Symmetry: C3
Subunit: 553 residues, 3 copies
Amino acid sequence: AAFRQEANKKFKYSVKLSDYSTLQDAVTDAVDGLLIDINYNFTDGESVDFXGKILTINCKAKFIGDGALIFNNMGPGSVINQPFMESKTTPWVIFPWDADGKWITDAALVAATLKQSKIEGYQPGVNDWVKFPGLEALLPQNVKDQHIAATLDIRSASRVEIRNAGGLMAAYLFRSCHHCKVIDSDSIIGGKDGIITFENLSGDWGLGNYVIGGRVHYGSGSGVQFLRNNGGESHNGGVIGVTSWRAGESGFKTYQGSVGGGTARNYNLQFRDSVALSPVWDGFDLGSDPGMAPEPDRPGDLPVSEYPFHQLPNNHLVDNILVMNSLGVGLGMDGSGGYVSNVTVQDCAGAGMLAHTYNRVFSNITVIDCNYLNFDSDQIIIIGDCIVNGIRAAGIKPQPSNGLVISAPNSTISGLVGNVPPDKILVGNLLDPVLGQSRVIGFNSDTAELALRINKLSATLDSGALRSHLNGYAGSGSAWTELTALSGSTPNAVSLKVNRGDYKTTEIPISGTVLPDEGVLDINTMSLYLDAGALWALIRLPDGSKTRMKLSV
Amino acid sequence: AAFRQEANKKFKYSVKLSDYSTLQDAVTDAVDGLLIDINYNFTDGESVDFXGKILTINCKAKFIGDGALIFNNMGPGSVINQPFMESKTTPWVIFPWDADGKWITDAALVAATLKQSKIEGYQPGVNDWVKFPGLEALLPQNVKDQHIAATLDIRSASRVEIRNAGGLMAAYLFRSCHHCKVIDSDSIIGGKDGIITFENLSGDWGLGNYVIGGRVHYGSGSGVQFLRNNGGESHNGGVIGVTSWRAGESGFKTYQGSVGGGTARNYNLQFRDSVALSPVWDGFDLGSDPGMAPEPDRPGDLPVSEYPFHQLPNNHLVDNILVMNSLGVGLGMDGSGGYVSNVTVQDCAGAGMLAHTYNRVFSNITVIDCNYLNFDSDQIIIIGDCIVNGIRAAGIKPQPSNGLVISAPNSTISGLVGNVPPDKILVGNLLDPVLGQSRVIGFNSDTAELALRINKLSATLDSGALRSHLNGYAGSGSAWTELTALSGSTPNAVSLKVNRGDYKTTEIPISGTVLPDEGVLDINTMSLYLDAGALWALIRLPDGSKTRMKLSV
Amino acid sequence: AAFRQEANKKFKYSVKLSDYSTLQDAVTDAVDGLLIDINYNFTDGESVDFXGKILTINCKAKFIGDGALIFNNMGPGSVINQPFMESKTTPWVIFPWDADGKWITDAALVAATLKQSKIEGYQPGVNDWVKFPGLEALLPQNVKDQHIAATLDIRSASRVEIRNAGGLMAAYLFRSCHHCKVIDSDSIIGGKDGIITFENLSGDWGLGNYVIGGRVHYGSGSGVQFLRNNGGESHNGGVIGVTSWRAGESGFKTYQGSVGGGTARNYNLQFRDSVALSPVWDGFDLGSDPGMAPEPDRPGDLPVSEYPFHQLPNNHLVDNILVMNSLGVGLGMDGSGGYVSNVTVQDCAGAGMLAHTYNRVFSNITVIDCNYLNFDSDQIIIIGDCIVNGIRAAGIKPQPSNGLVISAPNSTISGLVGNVPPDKILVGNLLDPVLGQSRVIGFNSDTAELALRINKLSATLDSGALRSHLNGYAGSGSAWTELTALSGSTPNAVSLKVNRGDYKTTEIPISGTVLPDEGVLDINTMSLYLDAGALWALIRLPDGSKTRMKLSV
Ligand code: NA
């Protein structure tokens, strides 16, 4: 027993699941470490009490079951390394992508993808009935009633970290937790529920809860979702460095509206350095208020008298995010106030951005090659009084026949770049007030121009131009400049020209008919016209009266 | 004893603090692991000798004390997991933020926030006497003399990592260390000293020392700070992926000047993918030379004869950083040479950038809604001969009445975007020399224009314009173009017009008075004027002489 | 034996290398953990069988040897913490950087840097014979025949992670692996081979293999390289958050062409949030097809009949990358389709980008101060039919005398920013079609202008301008506007002026010689000329005929 005391003092404590016959039995005996060394088949609702102990759980095997494996009373600072949640049942799933990776949108074609799989696709539900109209009638009731996921449900914990999580038809759910993190997820294949969820509907608002690094795949819901989290003025919560691919709902979601009669909304979260690829709905769905507005107020939240619907000061910190190939909307948001920067949305089947926002600033935005499936939608939509500073809005695909590129009727936009069709923009104001010494260069052309267009007058026709044209041939050393104006809906119809033909003269438009008095406006100005084959001047004199003078003989 | 040898060969070695009565006693007995399983109350200056052993220290409890807990002779490659430093004393702190999150700047109001807390606010000191003038007289001497922090002081170590650090009124200090890292800090609440500090004032310059990921909060000093670190040409050192919130000084700081009679300056460090929120002074303070210049040379550093003050080749790698709501300056720097890219400063109470820099390039910069408290300061300041390529400089807030938007009198700027007031810019040159085929579009307007302004002539009045105006009504198919010039300080006073009224003529300004000979300049040009009610031409002929011809009868 | 069973149930299992006399012997006895507690000197080809066991290998010492240490049959989920590979031999290396950090390019000067070192520089080889012409003849055969590296060779494993790897003349090689990661590398000093390599030439294409975080230094080859990896539509593989410094080849490389008679190419990998500094060849070399084209087809890959050479749909996800000081090309790529965003290449000795690409989009690009050694190369090269949206293309260094800034003859470019020489651009089209209400401001100047240039006519001379000039002096309240045209290769030769001298008149160019009929073009226009000392008008009348009218008496 000299050795018993020596050993107890010098060796690390860990128990291993294979030495017990229930997960609870192993946890009861644990002091420091717990090794999951054999697969463990759990029952729905199986509950494990950690007695407030701060354990390091090292997983080297799987938790298999349908339903929830519930972890209660974990001590703060506990760590779960490499957990793997796998459903027992192999569910029926749809797979709305073809062999070449293209979206399948036709209900009958989507229905024909139906197969049993634990490794790809997702279990269809109410959202799919809207996304693929007609699908609901093509599937049997037992498929529609499925709800398969192996869920790790961590309850009322603080400062618990899950590292390098995996799974098949899996969910990780934190209920009433704070300062909890899910780090470096290992391409978790989702099941029926959101893949990673922080749910704080009761108790204190959620705070300090994050998903950092790693990736999630598929799932019938959203990759990462929050309910009643507030990161506070410190913005202590959210998503940094995460990728979602082929989410059945959205990559990343802040819940909208109410759940269980009280608010599920979120405030002051980060969404940074993250990527959503091919979500069925949105890349990032960051709104607070639901579109269908089924209640007139916000139980448990700020009242509508203080902030109208879609005007909450949600104040998320959104920077350096990327979305590609969304079927819904790339970036969806609502609210008042705040900043959005460094966003890249490219090659989305539906709209690129739909911001139902007021008094928000958007800087350094790229939304290109969106609406490539030609939905009846605009590519970039801003509803309220916002500012856009620097936006690239044209890619390489031919423009869809439906919709505008930009619809931002109450916004001011500067720094719009790309081969954007000038007739497919609706904005409050488009402004570039601080160019320096400037130059327009025409390439592969006989001309260089600065055209002018007045949208109110005509969306499709330039109203006038300043244009330079080469005289003769490349290398001639001579060009001509013109100032033009639209007439009879014909661009450049009326044109004043300097140095055409290298004659070093000015060709001046004159009226071929006798001008009325209104043909001259300002004092000390002259307009020219023809009358009975003679050249005449109509002049407004220094005293403001008008006179006519014959100039030819 | 068969078992003694079997056990010694098959079990992991770890000792636990609860089996001993001093931290030193536990460390002396450690071989591989050390578990901190019970809180440990240390005395200031308590020193622990690790005997060169490479330990993994797993903390599941706190180190509590006022002053420094000193770790000597750690072996290379040691790891400290989840340490938590907590002060013994609960200090008096100020809290210059109100209930709505707004800055409190009035000294009496800041003084009234004084309370005892270990969890938020900071202990005031000499910097606060300048930041909140009058505060110094409102606080008692014992508050002013406080210096509470629980400091983990790691001395002369190599390749030691601290992971998932926490604390309350805490500091982590590395003295004369190299290749040391502080990773994924868990919202460490700072105390009187900088939160994380690498101090290499003696010995070899610091190299390879980083803060990677995670967050720090409050502190009376800077979140992360370096003294006499040089990352070398490899840029092996700095900050990647870190957030600081409500630093009492600056988020991230390279020390300026001398400490203890020798340089504390830094070179070739990274500042990337990092965020400073609501610092009292600067978001990132990256200068090398101090503003007050209390010595004429640089002991231990490059001489002033080689590089004048504010001209050191500090060469930090600064990319993808974000600052919001700073009370001081968002981004502060000095030095010569180098590159800064992808910076976003938004919604700062004081200036957004103050670069006392020479021969530096700034690309893809956003500095918007800065100086919102209307200090007597410009928003964006560059002192020396720099280049700015792409800068967004206007947000949604009304402009402050004081200061310029940009003051960069020796710099060249291209790609300036936003609704920037054209009279609130002072630059060396503003240049956009490579526009392509271009078009100006007016929205919600009867006109579209390209105005011209000559700053020397007038900062506030356009000197002339090319303008298009609709004829009549939306859909008329007709517009008119004018070329205008300023006269008598009235914009567009003198105007040549093409197609006004859809008459297809040119209205030409003429002099209402007899022109002097100087009224025509170039050979083979003509100016028109009125004399005794007749139209005359003043013409410079091919031989260079001038003549007057009567055109009317 | 009560205690034997008690101990076996409560303590963590780990074996340590010092209790054995071969690494295999220790591994055979391992169950859970393995501690490398003493240096281990291995022989080339030493092979260790892990028997499918899922081990955590904690290294606190080095693996020293020349050649490969081979790890077979590792169980999935194994982890190797802090390995350190060090060569036995100290090789002869070159060091083509001088004391001030500048490149050494002269063969004799590079040859003179030859020294024996394990800690910096690299072993020269066939690429250096091309990079430094003449070097091959200056080195002895035994230096040329060297091939020193200590290689950790992990074979046919899944979900194995290496964390915090280090080394001296080291390589980490994964052969036929999947879902393997190399995380937070600790400035591994490379040897003769690529530093980190995923080689999947046989078996299934590589999938899920990454390098995340950390840094690599030197090496004679590329920092990170892939062979026959396909991240699939999910883009599950690549490089995130990594830095390479002074790679003897390229920072990051997708292999081109064939190895061993079958393809070594790669598809659908990420290259994000990563930095290449001072590579001898490229920062990122992301092409698929080799330049020298030594075979007419692609064994094991897509046929040339489907995709011509340089047109593969490689579809890498490239975003937020930074390159500086490359001697070769900063960013090299080829292929068809796809997107590249948020790239920063600055201060490169050779070209900044060489994209042999077709139907690709580039958005938010900075390529500045490239070709600073004045190679016979353009700075930015795009070969095929691409789109560039937003590009900063001028820094602070004087332009090199050789080459163009941009050579993209089949591309369309918008949003080109910087003081780019207008004569050093060759593009398909340069287009800025959606400016808003605009203004040009001249600083430190008597004038403000919008110049026009027609590249076909002249690359170097403006063809015309709209210019504003101050009248008299600062504060006069008066300016004049002119519309000018090029003649006799003299810019602004022919000029129509409004309000010069504040006379409120128009100075109109007229022909000093009798105009031919071709001197007037449009109906109801007039050109003026002198004939025998009189002013005449040449007018095209409403019926289309031309007439001449004498206007003076
Ligand atoms: Na006459």
